[PDB]
Write a protein that binds this ligand. Structure first.
Ligand SMILES: *C(C)[C@H]1/C(=C/C2=NC(=C\c3[nH]c(C[C@H]4NC(=O)C(C=C)=C4C)c(C)c3CCC(=O)O)/C(CCC(=O)O)=C2C)NC(=O)[C@@H]1C
Ligand SMILES: *[C@@H](C)[C@H]1/C(=C/C2=NC(=C\c3[nH]c(C[C@H]4NC(=O)C(C=C)=C4C)c(C)c3CCC(=O)O)/C(CCC(=O)O)=C2C)NC(=O)[C@@H]1C
Ligand SMILES: *[C@@H](C)[C@H]1/C(=C/C2=NC(=C\c3[nH]c(C[C@H]4NC(=O)C(C=C)=C4C)c(C)c3CCC(=O)O)/C(CCC(=O)O)=C2C)NC(=O)[C@@H]1C
Ligand SMILES: *[C@@H](C)[C@H]1/C(=C/C2=NC(=C\c3[nH]c(C[C@H]4NC(=O)C(C=C)=C4C)c(C)c3CCC(=O)O)/C(CCC(=O)O)=C2C)NC(=O)[C@@H]1C
Ligand SMILES: *[C@H](C)[C@H]1/C(=C/C2=NC(=C\c3[nH]c(C[C@H]4NC(=O)C(C=C)=C4C)c(C)c3CCC(=O)O)/C(CCC(=O)O)=C2C)NC(=O)[C@@H]1C
Ligand SMILES: *[C@H](C)[C@H]1/C(=C/C2=NC(=C\c3[nH]c(C[C@H]4NC(=O)C(C=C)=C4C)c(C)c3CCC(=O)O)/C(CCC(=O)O)=C2C)NC(=O)[C@@H]1C
Ligand SMILES: *[C@H](C)[C@H]1/C(=C/C2=NC(=C\c3[nH]c(C[C@H]4NC(=O)C(C=C)=C4C)c(C)c3CCC(=O)O)/C(CCC(=O)O)=C2C)NC(=O)[C@@H]1C
Ligand SMILES: *[C@H](C)[C@H]1/C(=C/c2[nH]c(/C=C3N=C(/C=C4\NC(=O)C(CC)=C4C)C(C)=C\3CCC(=O)O)c(CCC(=O)O)c2C)NC(=O)[C@@H]1C
Ligand SMILES: C=CC1=C(C)[C@@H](Cc2[nH]c(/C=C3N=C(/C=C4\NC(=O)[C@H](C)[C@H]4CC)C(C)=C\3CCC(=O)O)c(CCC(=O)O)c2C)NC1=O
Ligand SMILES: C=CC1=C(C)[C@@H](Cc2[nH]c(/C=C3N=C(/C=C4\NC(=O)[C@H](C)[C@H]4CC)C(C)=C\3CCC(=O)O)c(CCC(=O)O)c2C)NC1=O
Ligand SMILES: C=CC1=C(C)[C@@H](Cc2[nH]c(/C=C3N=C(/C=C4\NC(=O)[C@H](C)[C@H]4CC)C(C)=C\3CCC(=O)O)c(CCC(=O)O)c2C)NC1=O
Ligand SMILES: CCC1=C(C)/C(=C/C2=NC(=C\c3[nH]c(/C=C4\NC(=O)[C@H](C)[C@H]4CC)c(C)c3CCC(=O)O)/C(CCC(=O)O)=C2C)NC1=O
Ligand SMILES: CCC1=C(C)/C(=C/C2=NC(=C\c3[nH]c(/C=C4\NC(=O)[C@H](C)[C@H]4CC)c(C)c3CCC(=O)O)/C(CCC(=O)O)=C2C)NC1=O
Lengths: 160, 145, 48, 172, 164, 161, 39, 177, 177, 164
């Protein structure tokens, strides 16, 4: 949350929120009705984003679903697509919070040591996040897509 | 080890800067304790009274000595914050005597102060997040000023 | 519009920092780091 | 014995996987190098009598105790055995150049050779000097133009020099 | 091509006179500033591949509209030309620290640049976001000397003034 | 610490669901009052020293607490007590912006009743100084903001008893 | 995916300028009639 | 037009390369032996009107076919225009000594001079002798081995400046011919 | 590198022989003619500044295309790197005369010099001229037949010191050639 | 090899200078020292089979258990390889008096020699009992000059302290 992240920056320096930090929190709450409409555009398009984003992934990385890959089998490919739904849900949390804090604490902290324990290619999960960003950003306008595009951009770099 | 509570890029430049021999063990420890990883781990969830007992534990290997020390660090954490706290520990004369610029701090079983032995043993014998108790909240007031 | 204008420099700078770490872990892996006998003797250095 | 193409197949069978799409594309660069890798093997095979003899003659000029009586390369039978060890190591380096993988070199030639020269008394620090002299005679002959079209063969003679360095630290 | 040297040997060539005592007194100041500006050139020559990476994506962090279809960097080989355009300007700033004047940036970077970037639809507001990021990330004890960062950041806002 | 936004996202995430229509109304209730909190938080940061000055004069100044034999008698003991009122005013302003008292349970109230018992600081007089800060603050920020700020002044007083 | 190592925005230089050069005062001083590292 | 520092950056521009620690060290020695260059320009420009009156009249005493009618330095008008012709050449050499290369000498003094003297009928071999006496005059003053005037310097070796000024005077002779 | 003393050791170790007899006699000649040899090294390092610059600027006035644009000694960055080469070559021929054996010249200076002078494109026939110019100066400063400067020495025949330093200079010639 | 002229020329090259006039003094001081140093080496080379024969059997007089069966002097061929080894070390000292340094003894006769004699079960005390006998058999009249015997007895001291 933009509010929580600005308080821990002030509490660390033992001070009050500066007028520049308070001015950012003001336009964060006033733009809440517009940011709630961007998160609901993705919430009503899960079937298209997770199905298309997962179909595009298996064409750029066919070896993860081929016999011998991590996501091989009916139940294993389903868990594969289950994870793209976990990360699309967190991106809607971050659009509403105004910060990458919900994505970081749920599904980015300890994610590399996690996937390495299951034997999952971390670069195959970043490829599926880049393919969901292609579907999701095509549902939005010029602005309101750069906003959605950032939370997909951070999840890529932070995951690698 | 940081693998379970970091994303992976918070203290990556401090590591590369140390392996090149550019910074000493004392600079790598000051730069490591005043990072976003330490602030998120040992400053946000706890009050300043518990942040003092953890700061001496990690950077000095011992619990707080006496009341004059608790009220000295408490005034730093009220005015200047966390990063001025870490500088007062690493730049102290006690640090330079026992750890210098080439050693990493250790558990440091103490003897001489009145309760520093049993207090330092309660800090280092408890596991991380074992409970939310403050070991040395303060010293019971001795008569006088 | 005012909200984005205040966070644009914060956001692009935190993405550059995350990619400088990936580039460093890749040149460090090829440079022989993490191949030591003390790294392969841990369980998390075997996953890496 | 497996080449560069069968090396990535053997690494993927131990994981039980199909080849990745960047692994097919990196094998398509080796096919594109191709005609040039065959120029390097053609240039050190057509001069293989002169790589060995010019770098044998240069070895007994700096180390004259090797051909003194009692030295290791002193007799007709021990001199002819030094000249064919140089011709064998040059043979398996050119096999490893055409394969793209040092697996024919260190299974057929380099494995067990350090412990063999110690059983015979052969100074392995002097075999390494004779290998490093064949390296300079080969890389000076790999990058001359002389009937080939002009281009960049620099990462292929850096691989040829790497096989000679591997054989020279494995004899001692 | 614009130096301490070339402005005093073409002023006395235009008057038709010899090198005078005021001409040699300008070449004395070329000796004195050379310790500070060649230090800034040597730090830039060893670190240029990381300072055009972090300043090239200060353009695209600020201007996300440039990656739309029909825009300036819309495929990957136009984004690589953008970092190449930044790396051309950092090479020319490094030449000005060596020469001792804005000669290589005037002739090879600035002359003709308004006509090119208007014809080719390249916004110069995104070129100056790349150069003002580099001027604002300078740290005069950390990155170079005190006076090495005075004239590293003087050729950087010579580009900012001539592209705006 | 977690604010009203964090607590609404948590109730949905603990089921694995997106934000439904009930979650969006709880989020609109926060965004509506968010401009009144930013305005009270800016006026408290400017009169932070005047609020504590006016609040001590109303409660602690000419009593047994400051006379010889009181807890705030000596000068070190007077400066140490107004440095505590800076803690309470600064952290109650964090909790008002966030709309959650979660930062008071962690950063303020943990181990605080045990610190005051060791030193001998009076609890009944501490609560009366925080309640004087609630009047002085509610006069600067009005009734709407003053009734929200007093919700966290009361949280400290109830956890301190 | 999307790794940016080095100067990714331009193809590297050929580097094919390998030639010998006398190392005045940098030539390694070798033993005569012998080889290094003891016997 | 160019100096020695911008001759370096047009060589690095041909390779699209940054000028760094290899060929910065050749420029740090240019700055360090830089007060040697400024004393050496100052000794040329202080003896310049004796130096041009002696090289032109030295050219007369070698070949006295220029004082007979039909000569090219025959008239009173042509002696002034030859004594002005030889101090343009000294002026552009001392620009090239002060700068560090001979690209002010190529562009502004030696462009079209060969085509001028052919169209004027100015004899070429008498002119090379006029700049060869100026070459021997220049290396005497800046190694301080002049027989009629000695100037006060600090002590040291300036023979590589005097081998640089003779390459500038041999550039004038090669383009006239 | 080997001097005259190391070389008889490595030539007799290669035969497993004791140093004595005809090989020890040539070492007594080195000790007997020791003062005489050290003047021949002294009569080079005192003129080593103007032995170089007379040679580099001497080959320019015989082949003046080297300073024309396109020539190899055109810019001041190319002319300064040629003056540095004539001093490096003369520094090792002085080292090889003082040691009495050519192995410091053959290893540190001429090893891989012919392969470097073609990759840069230095003209070979122009480079061996300046060596031949420096060769005539060295055999003149040793025999004391230098016509612009004499030296105060003792009386005696320094033949075969000049013939030995003649044999080092054409070894520099036959390397790059 | 560190030698007479070689060790000065190699130090006048690490500084990159010409031979100094203070670099020609240590050359002349090393040429005058080598006159007596060559007189020792001419004596040892002219009469070596007599000085080896009487130094070899001084080892077997002191250690008469080496001629026992099972030991390092058991055959006659093992005896002849003992007098060969004393003649090897007297040859390397002759090379050290010509070079004027302990270079030939280090590389060609000491490096790895201690590890060879352990694997072959030869006592290093028996190699030094034949060089110690040679050191004190030297007489400053009738063998060599009193200055030559100082250099000759220091390289025998270097070999004694290297084997033992
Ligand atoms: C050939 C190069 C010369 C020549 C040489 C002679 N020099 C003679 C004696 C001599 N030389 C020096 C200087 C030299 N000795 C040093 O110790 C040092 C520096 C450390 C140097 C430069 C000295 C001091 C002496 C001794 C003077 C004396 O006592 O008389 C010399 C005569 C002795 C001999 O032949 O060995 C000769 C012939 N003389 C020549 O005619 C040519 C040109
Ligand atoms: C100093 C008063 C500043 C400060 C800044 C920090 N900079 C950090 C990294 C950094 N800085 C630059 C630009 C700089 N490097 C160069 O090589 C040149 C010019 C030749 C310049 C102007 C770059 C490109 C980077 C990233 C790579 C690197 O670390 O070298 C930095 C490290 C944290 C980070 O990665 O962002 C800091 C803290 N230091 C200070 O204390 C103030 C804020
Ligand atoms: C003016 C007097 C200067 C000066 C000039 C120098 N002139 C130098 C050499 C030189 N001068 C002449 C002309 C002179 N010689 C003649 O035979 C005749 C008449 C027929 C004249 C007028 C010639 C021919 C030469 C030699 C040319 C050459 O060597 O190639 C000269 C260099 C030698 C020296 O240092 O003396 C200088 C410096 N000398 C002065 O000090 C005043 C200031
Ligand atoms: C001086 C009065 C001495 C002394 C000298 C004697 N030496 C006798 C025999 C002898 N000496 C050598 C010298 C040998 N040691 C060396 O270090 C070198 C040169 C490097 C040499 C040549 C040898 C080999 C021999 C044996 C010859 C032989 O046995 O025939 C000697 C006896 C004469 C003789 O036996 O012929 C004497 C008196 N002896 C002394 O007591 C003082 C200290
Ligand atoms: C690299 C070490 C050489 C060099 C090599 C090049 N060869 C090029 C093309 C080429 N090579 C062949 C022959 C192929 N068939 C064979 O039988 C053998 C072995 C005997 C070989 C290598 C052919 C037929 C061709 C032309 C076919 C084609 O190009 O499609 C080549 C590319 C040409 C260019 O880049 O211009 C290179 C670089 N060239 C060198 O300069 C070094 C010394
Ligand atoms: C004297 C030592 C020579 C000689 C010289 C003459 N030059 C004459 C005319 C002339 N010279 C130039 C070139 C000069 N002017 C410049 O502006 C520049 C550089 C930018 C240079 C090098 C020009 C253009 C002219 C024509 C203009 C004019 O006529 O004044 C000249 C006059 C010829 C005549 O009318 O008789 C003379 C005598 N001639 C000689 O014989 C010696 C070698
Ligand atoms: C070579 C042509 C000369 C010679 C030159 C040396 N000059 C040295 C020091 C030096 N020279 C100057 C003169 C010059 N510098 C200026 O700024 C101006 C006018 C504006 C002029 C005319 C100065 C001021 C200095 C002082 C620098 C210092 O000493 O710190 C010098 C010493 C070595 C060096 O610093 O380069 C030399 C060798 N000396 C000669 O004998 C020939 C003839
Ligand atoms: C020559 C440069 C150096 C040298 C060589 C030397 N080698 C031998 C003897 C043998 N060498 C081998 C070598 C190989 N056998 C293999 O199978 C392979 C591929 C794996 C190699 C490289 C073998 C088996 C022998 C023994 C059999 C034989 O008769 O050759 C000798 C002869 C030793 C002897 O006669 O006792 C010599 C001299 N020695 C040198 O001094 C050079 C440095
Ligand atoms: C020696 C000095 C020197 C320079 C400074 C550059 C200047 C320069 N840049 C470009 C060319 C370009 N420059 C950019 C740069 C940008 N576009 C963006 O998205 C951002 C606005 C911005 C930097 C972040 C792009 C995309 C092109 C290619 C334009 C095109 O192909 O249409 C061109 C056109 C020629 C070509 O297409 O190759 C020129 C002359 N070139 C030089 O030779
Ligand atoms: C220890 C032994 C040793 C040497 C002998 C020299 C040899 C040498 N010279 C040059 C380099 C050079 N050498 C010359 C010299 C000449 N070119 C000519 O036209 C003339 C014929 C000739 C001198 C009169 C020039 C002009 C260059 C520079 C070439 C260039 O930069 O393009 C280089 C390349 C290094 C560099 O460019 O900085 C080397 C190794 N250097 C050494 O370290
Ligand atoms: C066109 C330009 C041009 C030059 C610059 C000169 C350059 C030059 N000088 C010499 C030849 C020489 N150069 C010198 C050098 C010197 N003499 C001294 O007394 C000084 C101390 C020292 C200069 C500092 C010596 C000693 C000789 C040998 C002949 C002589 O004694 O002069 C030679 C070779 C002559 C030969 O032996 O065949 C040449 C070409 N000649 C030219 O044609
Ligand atoms: C034993 C050490 C000690 C000291 C010194 C002390 C001071 C002290 N001074 C006070 C007030 C005060 N002190 C002053 C003092 C002054 N006004 C002036 O103009 C003068 C410059 C200055 C006196 C020389 C005033 C006016 C007040 C009342 C302020 C108010 O109520 O607003 C108060 C609050 C009311 C009270 O008296 O209880 C304390 C506690 N307490 C201590 O324990
Ligand atoms: C961030 C949360 C937090 C709090 C609140 C905190 C309080 C705290 N209050 C302290 C003391 C004190 N606190 C007081 C307070 C008071 N005296 C009175 O009469 C009043 C009733 C009351 C103020 C309203 C006094 C007088 C002392 C000093 C006791 C002494 O010196 O013996 C001390 C001991 C250090 C010192 O003396 O400075 C701590 C650690 N620490 C924390 O981390």
């Amino acid at each position: 949350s933009i509010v929580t992240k600005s308080i821990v920056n002030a509490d660390a320096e033992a001070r009050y929120l500066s007028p520049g930090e308070l001015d950012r929190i003001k336009s964060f709450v006033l733009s809440g009705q517009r940011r709630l409409r961007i998160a609901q555009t993705l919430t009503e398009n899960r079937e298209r984003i997770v199905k298309q984003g997962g179909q595009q992934l298996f064409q750029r990385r066919p070896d993860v679903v081929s016999p011998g890959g991590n996501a091989y089998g009916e139940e294993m490919t389903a868990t594969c697509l289950r994870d793209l739904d976990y990360y699309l849900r967190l991106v809607t949390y971050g659009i509403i919070a105004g910060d990458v804090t919900p994505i970081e604490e749920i599904g980015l902290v300890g994610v590399k040591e996690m996937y390495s324990a299951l034997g999952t290619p971390i670069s195959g999960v970043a490829e599926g996040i880049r393919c969901m960003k292609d579907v999701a950003c095509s549902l939005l306008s010029g602005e309101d897509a750069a906003e959605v595009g950032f939370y997909f951009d951070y999840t890529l770099a932070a995951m690698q | 080890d940081i693998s379970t509570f970091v994303i992976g890029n918070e203290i990556e430049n401090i590591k590369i800067q140390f392996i090149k021999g550019q910074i000493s063990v004392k600079e790598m420890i000051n730069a490591l304790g005043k990072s976003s990883v330490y602030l998120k781990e040992f400053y946000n969830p706890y009050p300043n009274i518990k942040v003092i007992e953890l700061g001496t534990k990690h950077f000095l290997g011992r619990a707080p000595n006496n009341q004059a020390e608790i009220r000295f660090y408490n005034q730093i954490l009220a005015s200047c914050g966390l990063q001025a706290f870490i500088d007062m520990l690493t730049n102290s004369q006690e640090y330079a005597e026992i750890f210098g610029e080439v050693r990493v701090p250790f558990r440091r079983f103490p003897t001489l102060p009145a309760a520093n032995f049993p207090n330092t043993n309660t800090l280092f014998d408890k596991q991380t997040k074992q409970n939310s108790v403050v070991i040395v909240p303060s010293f019971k007031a001795i008569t006088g000023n | 519009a005012k909200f984005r204008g205040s966070v644009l420099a914060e956001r692009g700078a935190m993405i550059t920092k995350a990619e400088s770490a990936t580039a460093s872990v890749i040149t460090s892996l090829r440079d022989g780091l993490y191949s030591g006998e003390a790294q392969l003797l841990t369980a998390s250095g075997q996953r890496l | 014995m497996l080449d560069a193409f069968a090396k990535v197949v053997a690494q993927a069978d131990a994981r039980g996987e199909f080849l990745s799409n960047t692994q097919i594309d990196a094998l398509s660069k080796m096919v594109k190098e191709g005609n040039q890798r065959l120029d390097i093997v053609n240039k050190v095979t057509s001069n293989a009598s002169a790589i060995v003899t010019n770098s044998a003659r240069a070895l007994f000029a700096e180390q004259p105790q090797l051909i003194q009586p009692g030295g290791n390369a002193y007799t007709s039978r021990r001199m002819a055995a030094c000249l064919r060890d140089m011709e064998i190591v040059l043979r398996y380096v050119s096999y490893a150049m055409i394969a793209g993988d040092s697996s024919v070199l260190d299974d057929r030639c380099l494995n067990g050779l350090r412990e063999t020269y110690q059983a015979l008394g052969t100074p392995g620090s002097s075999v390494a000097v004779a290998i490093q002299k064949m390296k300079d005679a080969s890389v000076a002959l790999a990058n001359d133009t002389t009937g080939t079209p002009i281009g960049d063969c620099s990462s292929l003679v850096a691989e040829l020099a790497g096989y000679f360095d591997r054989a020279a630290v494995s004899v001692v | 091509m614009k130096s301490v040297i070339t402005t005093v040997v073409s002023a006395a060539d235009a008057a038709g006179r010899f090198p005078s005592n005021s001409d040699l007194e300008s070449i004395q100041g070329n000796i004195q500033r050379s310790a500070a500006r060649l230090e800034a050139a040597e730090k830039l020559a060893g670190n240029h591949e990381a300072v055009v990476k972090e300043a090239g994506d200060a353009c695209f962090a600020k201007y996300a509209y440039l990656k739309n279809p029909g825009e300036a960097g819309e495929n990957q080989e136009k984004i690589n030309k953008c970092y190449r355009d930044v790396d051309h300007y950092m090479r020319l700033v490094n030449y000005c620290l060596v020469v001792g004047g804005t000669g290589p940036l005037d002739e090879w970077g600035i002359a003709g640049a308004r006509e090119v970037y208007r014809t080719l639809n390249l916004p110069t507001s995104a070129y100056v976001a790349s150069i003002a990021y580099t001027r604002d990330r300078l740290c005069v004890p950390r990155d170079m000397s005190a006076q090495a960062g005075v004239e590293f950041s003087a050729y950087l806002d010579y580009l900012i003034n001539a592209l705006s | 610490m977690q604010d009203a936004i964090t607590s609404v996202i948590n109730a949905a995430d603990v089921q694995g669901k997106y934000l439904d229509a009930n979650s969006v109304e709880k989020l609109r209730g926060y965004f509506q009052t968010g401009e009144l909190r930013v305005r009270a938080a800016a006026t408290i940061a400017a009169n932070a020293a005047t609020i504590i000055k006016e609040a001590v004069a109303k409660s602690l100044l000419y009593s047994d607490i400051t006379r010889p034999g009181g807890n705030m008698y000596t000068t070190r003991r007077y400066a140490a007590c107004i440095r505590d009122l800076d803690y309470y005013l600064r952290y109650a302003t964090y909790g008002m912006l966030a709309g959650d008292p979660s930062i008071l349970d962690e950063r303020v109230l943990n181990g605080l009743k045990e610190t005051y018992n060791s030193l001998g600081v009076p609890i009944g007089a501490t609560i009366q100084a925080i309640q004087a800060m609630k009047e002085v603050t509610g006069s600067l920020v009005g009734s709407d903001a003053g009734k929200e700020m007093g919700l966290y002044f009361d949280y400290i007083c109830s956890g301190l008893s | 995916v999307a790794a940016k190592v080095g100067a990714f925005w331009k193809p590297k230089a050929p580097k094919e300028v390998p030639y010998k050069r006398p190392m005045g005062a940098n030539t390694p001083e070798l033993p005569y009639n012998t080889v290094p590292r003891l016997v | 037009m160019l100096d020695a520092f911008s001759r370096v950056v047009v060589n690095s521009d041909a390779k699209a390369a940054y000028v760094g620690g290899s060929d910065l060290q050749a420029l740090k020695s240019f700055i360090a032996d830089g007060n040697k260059r400024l004393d050496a320009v100052n000794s040329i420009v202080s003896n310049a009107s004796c130096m041009v009156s002696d090289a032109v009249s030295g050219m007369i005493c070698e070949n006295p076919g220029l004082i007979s009618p039909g000569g090219n330095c025959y008239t009173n008008r042509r002696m002034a225009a030859c004594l002005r012709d030889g101090e343009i050449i000294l002026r552009y050499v001392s620009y090239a000594l002060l700068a560090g290369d001979a690209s002010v000498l190529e562009d502004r003094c030696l462009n079209g001079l060969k085509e001028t003297y052919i169209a004027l009928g100015v004899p070429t071999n008498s002119s090379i002798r006029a700049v060869s006496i100026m070459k021997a005059q220049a290396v005497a003053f800046i190694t301080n081995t002049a027989t009629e005037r000695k100037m006060s310097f600090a002590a040291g070796d300036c023979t590589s400046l005097a081998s640089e000024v003779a390459s500038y005077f041999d550039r004038v002779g090669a383009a006239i011919s």
